[PDB]
């Protein structure tokens, strides 16, 4: 359902902004191009006995910086393109936070609403199973992403340690974990604390005061819902609408997130909210509002709406939300965009403090991951905005101007390309 192909949008947004730096053709070539690319087929037993083999994908783009980091995807409309557009999304996530990542990123063919527990931890189990050999807490670390979990993600980890024998740290193969297996503090709202932190930072760029402004978060999901919290909750802003695959719900006196969520919780759905009017998500996406977060699947917003939004500030919290024409689009419109792989890159941070964490055997407090978190995010952010404000140039550029290069770097600093 996808408007475009990912990976050639990615590969797309790569060569625009490579427009705007010095970086040699061979080392182009290299980053337009996945470093490894896995796919794999995954065997479990269904409830009825029977068999049923899926469809498993395990991308790493580069690997220059460290070890490839990115999330698992459970999806039934993924594609392989989809998991290399991620992939090479996560490089320049880890890029501009200034982590010792590569980019990575892993998949499954699968609707996971229809699988019970039983079958989804058999997946997790045979997944581990088929993609250990080009995983590890040095080569390659998953995470949670769209429709995983911390559960799932603890039975990943508990398999690898089975197949790993105990040899080292298991504990860091996997990121996104239950507290109790090695888990992290301040990891379920990770990428809602960064993506409020970039928020936080814009307005201050732009001069806005956040205080009674109105927010609009696409999808409910850890995203999306903790998004609407933090924001409802840190920023002082009012969440005029929330919305999931079903639909959507405006309320201009504002939702509070927990009802919303409980109440999600309790019928499957956001929808018909008491106090609330139903919508669709296109609709959502064209309100008048302060703040608008995409936080569910990507290319959301295109030609066929880019013309309609009207929000001062985009927090691209989804991975890849906005395509190129829409950019060029909204940035003519005088709207700030904060892209989609800085805004996002807290939970990809919180998951590298995870790591540390579990590799070095010590775990922190939620002070210090919150004031760490703050500090990497702030710079980031900082660092990209002068960096479109010097070079006069669109946000998403910007941001793939201070992250490839780094990874450009890295291939110098490897042998890898000599020019
Ligand atoms: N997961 C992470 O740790 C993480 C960290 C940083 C960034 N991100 C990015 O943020 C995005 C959201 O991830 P997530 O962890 O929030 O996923 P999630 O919580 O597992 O679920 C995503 C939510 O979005 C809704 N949704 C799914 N497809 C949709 C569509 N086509 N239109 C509207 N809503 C839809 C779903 O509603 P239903 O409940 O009705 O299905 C679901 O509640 C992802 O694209 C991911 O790349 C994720
Ligand atoms: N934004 C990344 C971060 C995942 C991670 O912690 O590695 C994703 O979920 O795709």
Request: net charge negative; proline share 5%.
């Given at each position: ?59 790493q ?7 490839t980091k990115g999330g698992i ?13 991620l992939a090479?999304?996560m ?12 980019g990575g990123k892993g ?33 390659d670390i998953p995470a949670?992403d ?202 990809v ?71």
């Open positions: 359902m996808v408007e475009i192909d990912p990976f050639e949008m990615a590969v797309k947004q790569l060569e625009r902004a490579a427009q705007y730096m010095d970086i040699s053709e061979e080392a182009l070539e290299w980053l337009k191009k996945p470093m490894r690319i896995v796919e794999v087929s995954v065997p479990i037993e269904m409830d009825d006995g029977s068999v049923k083999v899926f469809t498993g994908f395990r991308v783009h580069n690997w220059a910086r460290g070890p995807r459970w999806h039934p409309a993924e594609t392989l393109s989809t998991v290399k557009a090479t999304w490089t320049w996530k880890v890029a501009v936070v200034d982590l010792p990542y590569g998949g499954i063919i699968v609707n996971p609403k229809e699988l019970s527990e039983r079958e989804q931890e058999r997946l997790a189990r045979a997944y581990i199973r088929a993609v250990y050999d080009v995983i590890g807490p040095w080569t949670p769209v429709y995983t979990n911390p559960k799932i993600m603890g039975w990943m980890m508990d398999e690898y340690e089975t197949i790993m024998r105990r040899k080292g740290p298991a504990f860091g193969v996997i990121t996104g974990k239950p507290l109790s297996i090695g888990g992290s503090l301040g990891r379920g709202t990770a990428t809602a604390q960064g993506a409020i932190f970039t928020i936080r930072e814009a307005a201050k760029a732009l001069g806005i005061d956040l205080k009674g402004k109105k927010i609009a978060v696409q999808g409910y999901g850890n995203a999306g819902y903790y998004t609407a919290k933090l924001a409802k909750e840190q920023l002082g802003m009012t969440v005029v609408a929330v919305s999931d695959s079903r639909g959507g719900i405006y309320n201009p006196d504002g939702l509070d997130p927990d009802e919303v969520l409980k109440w999600k919780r309790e019928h499957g759905s956001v929808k018909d909210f008491p106090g609330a009017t139903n919508i669709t998500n296109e609709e959502l996406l064209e309100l008048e509002v302060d703040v608008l977060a995409p936080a569910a699947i990507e290319e959301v917003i295109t030609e066929k709406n880019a013309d309609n939004i009207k929000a001062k500030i985009v927090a691209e919290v989804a991975n890849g939300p906005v395509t190129p024409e829409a950019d060029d689009i909204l940035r003519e419109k005088g709207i700030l965009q904060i892209p989609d792989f800085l805004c996002n890159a807290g939970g941070t919180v998951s590298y403090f995870e790591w540390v964490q579990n590799i070095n055997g010590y775990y922190w407090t939620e002070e210090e991951v919150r004031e760490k978190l703050d500090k990497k995010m702030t710079k980031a952010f900082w660092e990209v905005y002068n960096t479109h404000k010097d070079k006069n140039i669109h946000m998403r550029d910007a941001a793939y101007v201070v992250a490839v290069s780094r990874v450009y770097q890295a291939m110098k600093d490897r042998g890898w390309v000599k020019k």
